Amino acid sequence: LSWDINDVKLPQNVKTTDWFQEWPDSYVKHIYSSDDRNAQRHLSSWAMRNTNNHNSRILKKSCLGVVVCSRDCSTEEGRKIYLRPAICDKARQKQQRKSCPNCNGPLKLIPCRGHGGFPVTNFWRHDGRFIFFQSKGEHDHPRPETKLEAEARRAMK
DNA sequence: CGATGCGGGTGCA
DNA sequence: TGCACCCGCATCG
Ligand SMILES: [Zn+2]
Ligand SMILES: [Zn+2]
Q: Which amino acid positions bind Zn(2+) 2, per UniProt?
């Protein structure tokens, strides 16, 4: 159909089950199939943290921002550093203290707010044959490394 | 260690 | 009633 939100009931003549989106931005809405393993795990390559909206039916999550090198540093091939923020709150504290992996300077956590000045949010709800997606905002800060990229660091020498 | 989900409880419109 | 958010509980890779 056309209109879509967190409404009472969601239409179900879905023919177009969008393919899993990695970087939902600009208020994107989707209809991923519920067999979609990445849609099941409510993934996003943006660092999104769980948010409690008191509703077991709508999984809401808000954007953490992105960790950058406060010293504005840039590698040799002109690469800037955007670390993926830790999701566990206490971990992000211990993280902002760690030194930059490039210029060994201090790290700074730039937060998101591409929504009326508040961290961009997402919304997941499973309605039978599929998982519906909807977000509110547009990230006003550079993209972190992916869960996949981030883990590449930690799992090294 | 942390990613993720959950939900009680708070402070502001 | 909505929304943002702090805090602890629990699971699981
Ligand atoms: Zn640096
Ligand atoms: Zn963002």
A: 69, 73, 100, 103
The set of residues, in sequence order, having a beta carbon less than 8 Å from that of A51 and lying 6+ positions away, is A60, A61, A62, A121
Task: Determine phi and psi for A16, rounding to 5 degrees.
Answer: -95, 85
Delineate the domains of chain A, giving CATH numbers in brackets. 28-65+112-144 (2.20.25.670), 66-111+145-157 (3.30.70.3530)
Question: Could you tell me whether strands A107-110 and A131-136 are parallel, antiparallel, or unpaired per DSSP bridges?
Answer: unpaired
Q: Strand C: which bases are under 7 Å from protein Cβ?
A: 3-7
Amino acid sitting at position A15: K
Experimental method: X-ray
Q: Tell me, what DSSP letter sits at residue A86? A: P
Give yes or no for CB of A121 within 7 Å of strand C: yes
What residues are neighbours of ligand 2 (ion), with CB under 5 Å? A 63, 112, 120, 139
